[PDB]
Design a protein around this nucleic acid. Structure first.
Ligand SMILES: [Mg+2]
Lengths: 609, 67, 339
RNA sequence: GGCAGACCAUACGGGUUGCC
């Protein structure tokens, strides 16, 4: 089998710096990253003891808002108060402010329990925890463990050998849909594999690039009403988007099985898409393809959206084309030389709602309907923009407060709490006159990138813990064996060292002989060690001229321009490593050589022709 | 008015220094020659560079029992 | 016009103080010395091969017990070696890799060093264990640390790159007195054996004597063309000599108060790094740039011989207190011994 | 009028040549 293996602590000193120069290096921008919460809790709970009470506090506040009913919200509000707020003032180690406590005080004797009852405290939980606690976390071996994980994030570059495909489940356009699995861990995703040679044929390169670009902005925060993209990659003969996978089918197929649908049935389902639409409208995207056939369902039965295809950006540049499924179009998109916005979706939605009731499509409405639904669909499907809903100012909220969605609350729909009305069961050679061109492979850069967040989750459910310990299990048996062999306190301990790590030099620019060694950067030198010894090989910063990068048999590598009419070889394991050397590497020598001129003893002898 | 009195204190510090060095009584060149010539010739006998001492007495060559 | 009344009263001082010197000077050393026996060619042999430092070596210092030494190098470490056996007694890394000078206490118990940390870092060799640790951190000067020399195991004096020296009390870590006087950056300083007097050089091209206990300059010495790198003292406590980037050496007397002899051969272009006398004093050695020192009949000023062996700049040197042999610190990362 | 093909949609079935 295959399982991904972490790097070592050495990366910390390399990585730490990598982030600091970006800025994603504070209380928020680590915590935010749910792992950076997980390792925080793993730290804050298990090691620090002033933090533990604020964590079980914070964790149990999330388990108050996320509760089912309002009558059971009080039972947990009494479990909390008596302890997590009360107890801390009995030991008198409650640092929280007056107006903070007098909000929860007055309203937990009044008893009214809105979810934004304990919110003025949540910001003070944050407030205190970013002071020292945050800092003193940094100085932890868990904070290290993070870096180890985070490197693997920026090392991840995908292949086809990494995947274990089972079946096939789609054909259309440029490629075919494969139902894939991740062999490293083990979970079902959706590969949308494309055959490269058919894109230059049809010239659908604007739409192919578009369909990639859109997935990203959509697939940011988790939204179970949209099939989010996870990873993207290209190979010399194939292209693939890796996304969520679902069993069910589509609304066109189940309209065949069940037939026409009920009032309370469609209400639930229609509520699913509006939040997907909200997630599209809030980050400025239009699907331009609202259809029952283009909507999927999972093992539970909850719904999502499928073939983006025609989704183009309205962010800044509005497209005035005649785009859409010939049927679910508003009177704005159809016109030639006229702009439109979310209207193109809202109209297509109302068009879809009819089909999820009757079965065909033609304004007038039927007889045996309810009073609220007439006021709804007449608004959705109005010819003008100013008179139609969702195009006045709010957007998705004009749909929310409608009398149809009056009984239902908009926080329970949010969490898939309402049940699905019914359950789903569970029982070539055309193009051989086109080749691999070099003008085609120029525009495939800027394609393969993974979402920082969506991946972090992938691990959260699967095998984070069982790896966490298993690497720790060998981090002991390493240092244990390191001790057996007589210890060494990591060379760059108390000095003015900046950073250190791993790299591969070729012993001499001539042979084909790669030796990998460990390196230590200094203000005035560079040393490096092998397996056992303490440094016996060396290079000053005086000795260097400049430092460039270069391609080596299609591998980006480091040149070390030598003062004495020669050069030197380098190579890294991961991608980012390379970088942070270069940055403070390029600076260290220049600032080293800068102050060489100012000193009389240390200087190079003055030139004299 | 700033660097006027700043360079004056320095210029006054100079005349203080100049008068300090001028005070000392001096000795003629012949007096120093003999004192330190004779010193060189007085301690010239006991120099291991001038007198290439025996190999055994010399540690870095071959002095025997150490430690 | 008082600034004018000081400057015109300085040219008259300069010319009259120099007339007091030249009224004394009638004969030279060459006349005095021409009579006596010549040195003969002293051609030493390499003895020891101190493989150790990896980066370039800078200042060294001699262990008072004539078998040990501390040597400073760019590699951010200071080593203590046994000269007899070729064994590195202890290896120590500095807190700041910007090292310049190293020293050795008279007792041979504690040690000091430093550089562009702008600090004199100090350690102890035998604590209440054996593991070597930092004793104290010394700050004060704005610029770098050029050179440093002990009094005993309770006081010390340094020279810095803010154009001033300073005396220090080990107990406290405070300046006993201060020695403002040089306009150029101070470089090398030399102790009196009696330890109540000292001399030092600077980039302005002047040498100045200093009363140790009081805290002021006693004499000014002018002559050198370029920067004054090296310096050393004559055994009797009333004579000293220096080297420079001009590519010459000069000798000076104190009571007499002037230059005595110039050591300038016409096939010499490169500068000196640190100079030193013999036990007898007749022999002077300059840390040349051409990877070897030259001996000088300090009396007649004739070149005795050369120590070819290094393959890179000679940064410093020193004699054993008993005049037995000679060390040589060099940029080729080696230390060899000659007798 | 029906079927078959072409053009397109395809994790979907709806919008011109030949044959009765
Ligand atoms: Mg498509």
């Amino acid at each position: 089998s295959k399982k991904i293996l972490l790097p070592e602590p050495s990366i910390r000193s390399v990585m730490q710096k990598y982030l600091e120069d970006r800025g994603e290096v504070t209380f928020e921008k680590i915590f935010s990253q749910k792992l950076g919460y997980l390792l925080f809790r793993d730290f804050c709970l298990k090691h620090l003891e002033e933090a533990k009470p604020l964590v079980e506090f914070y964790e149990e506040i999330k388990k108050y808002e996320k509760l089912e009913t309002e009558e059971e919200r009080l039972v947990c509000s009494r479990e909390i108060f008596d302890t997590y707020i009360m107890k801390e003032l009995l030991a008198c180690s409650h640092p929280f402010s007056k107006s903070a406590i007098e909000h929860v005080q007055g309203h937990l004797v009044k008893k009214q329990v809105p979810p934004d009852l304990f919110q003025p405290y949540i910001e003070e939980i944050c407030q205190n925890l970013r002071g020292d606690v945050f800092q003193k976390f940094i100085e932890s071996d868990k904070f290290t463990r993070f870096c180890q994980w985070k490197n693997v994030e920026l090392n991840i570059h995908l292949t086809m050998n990494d995947f274990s495909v089972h079946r096939i489940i789609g054909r259309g356009g440029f490629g075919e849909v494969y139902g894939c699995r991740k062999a490293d861990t083990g979970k079902m995703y959706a590969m949308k594999c494309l055959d490269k040679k058919r894109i230059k044929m049809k010239q659908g390169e604007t739409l192919a690039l578009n369909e990639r670009i859109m997935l990203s902005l959509v697939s940011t925060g988790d939204c179970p009403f949209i099939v989010c993209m996870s990873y993207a990659f290209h190979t010399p003969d194939k292209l693939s988007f890796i996304l969520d996978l679902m069993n069910g089918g589509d609304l066109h197929y189940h309209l065949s099985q069940h037939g026409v649908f009920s009032e309370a049935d469609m209400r639930f389902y229609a509520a699913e898409i509006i939040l997907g639409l909200e997630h599209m409208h809030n980050r400025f995207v239009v699907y331009r393809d609202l259809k029952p056939a283009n909507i999927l369902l999972d093992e539970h039965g909850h719904v999502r959206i499928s073939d983006l295809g025609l989704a183009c950006d309205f962010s800044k540049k509005k497209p005035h084309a005649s785009v859409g499924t010939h049927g679910y179009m508003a009177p704005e998109v159809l016109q030639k030389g006229v702009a439109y916005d979310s209207s193109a979706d809202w109209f297509s939605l109302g068009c879809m709602l009819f089909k999820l009731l009757r079965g065909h499509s033609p304004v007038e409405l039927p007889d045996s309907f309810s009073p609220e639904l007439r006021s709804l669909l007449e608004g959705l499907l109005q010819r003008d923009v100013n008179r139609r809903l969702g195009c006045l100012g709010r957007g998705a909220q004009e749909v929310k407060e409608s009398p149809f969605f009056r009984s239902l609350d908009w926080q329970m729909v949010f969490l898939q709490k309402y049940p699905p009305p019914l359950i789903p069961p569970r029982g070539e050679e055309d193009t051989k006159g086109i080749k691999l061109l070099d003008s085609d492979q120029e525009l495939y850069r800027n394609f393969p990138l993974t979402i920082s967040e969506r991946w972090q989750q992938e691990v959260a459910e699967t095998v984070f813990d069982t790896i966490n310990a298993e690497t720790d299990r060998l981090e002991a048996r390493k240092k244990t064996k390191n001790k057996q062999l007589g210890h060494e306190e990591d060379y760059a301990l108390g000095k003015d060292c900046i950073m250190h790590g791993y790299m591969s030099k070729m012993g001499n620019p001539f042979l084909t002989q790669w030796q990998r060694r460990y390196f230590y950067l200094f203000p005035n030198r560079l040393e490096w060690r092998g397996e056992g010894e303490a440094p016996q090989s060396l290079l000053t910063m005086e000795e260097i001229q400049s430092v460039e990068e270069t391609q080596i048999k299609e591998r980006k590598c480091l040149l070390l321009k030598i003062r004495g009419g020669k050069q030197f070889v380098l190579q890294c394991d991961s991608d980012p490593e390379l970088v942070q050397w270069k940055k403070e590497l390029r600076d260290a020598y220049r600032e080293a050589q800068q102050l060489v001129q100012r000193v009389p003893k240390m200087k190079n002898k003055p030139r004299a022709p | 008015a700033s660097n006027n009195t700043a360079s004056i204190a320095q210029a006054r510090k100079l005349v203080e220094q100049l008068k300090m060095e001028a005070n000392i009584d001096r000795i003629k060149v012949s007096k120093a020659a003999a004192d330190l010539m004779a010193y060189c010739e007085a301690h010239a006998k006991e120099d291991p560079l001038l007198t290439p001492v025996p190999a055994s007495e010399n540690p870095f060559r071959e002095k025997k029992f150490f430690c | 016009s008082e600034l004018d009344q000081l400057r015109q009263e300085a040219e008259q001082l300069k010319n009259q103080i120099r007339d007091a010197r030249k009224a004394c000077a009638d004969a030279t050393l060459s006349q005095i010395t021409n009579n006596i026996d010549p040195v003969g060619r002293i051609q030493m042999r390499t003895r020891r091969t101190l493989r150790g430092h990896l980066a370039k070596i800078y200042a060294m210092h001699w262990g008072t017990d004539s078998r040990l030494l501390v040597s400073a190098s760019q590699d951010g470490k200071l080593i203590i070696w046994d000269s007899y056996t070729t064994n590195k007694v202890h290896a120590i890394p500095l807190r700041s890799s910007w090292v310049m000078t190293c020293a050795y206490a008279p007792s041979g118990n504690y040690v000091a060093c430093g550089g562009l940390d702008n600090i004199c870092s100090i350690y102890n060799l035998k604590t209440r264990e054996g593991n070597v640790r930092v004793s104290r951190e010394l700050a004060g000067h704005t610029g770098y640390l050029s050179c440093c020399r002990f009094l005993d195991d309770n006081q010390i004096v340094t020279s810095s790159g803010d154009t001033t020296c300073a005396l220090w009390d080990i107990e406290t870590g405070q300046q006993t007195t201060t020695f403002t006087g040089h306009t150029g950056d101070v470089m090398s300083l030399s102790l009196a054996p009696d330890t109540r007097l000292f001399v030092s050089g600077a980039c302005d091209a002047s040498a100045k004597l200093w009363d140790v206990r009081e805290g002021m300059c006693r004499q000014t010495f002018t002559g050198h063309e370029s920067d004054i790198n090296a310096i050393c003292f004559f055994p009797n406590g009333n004579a000293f000599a220096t080297g420079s980037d001009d590519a010459t050496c000069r000798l000076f007397d104190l009571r007499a108060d002037q230059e005595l002899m110039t050591y300038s051969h016409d096939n010499i272009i490169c500068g000196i790094t640190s100079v030193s006398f013999s036990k007898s004093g007749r022999l002077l050695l300059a840390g040349y740039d051409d990877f070897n020192c030259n001996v000088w009949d300090a009396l007649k000023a004739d070149r005795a011989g050369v120590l070819a062996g290094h393959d890179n700049r000679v940064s410093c040197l020193g004699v054993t207190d008993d005049g037995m042999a000679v060390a040589t610190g060099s940029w080729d990362s080696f230390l060899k011994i000659w007798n």
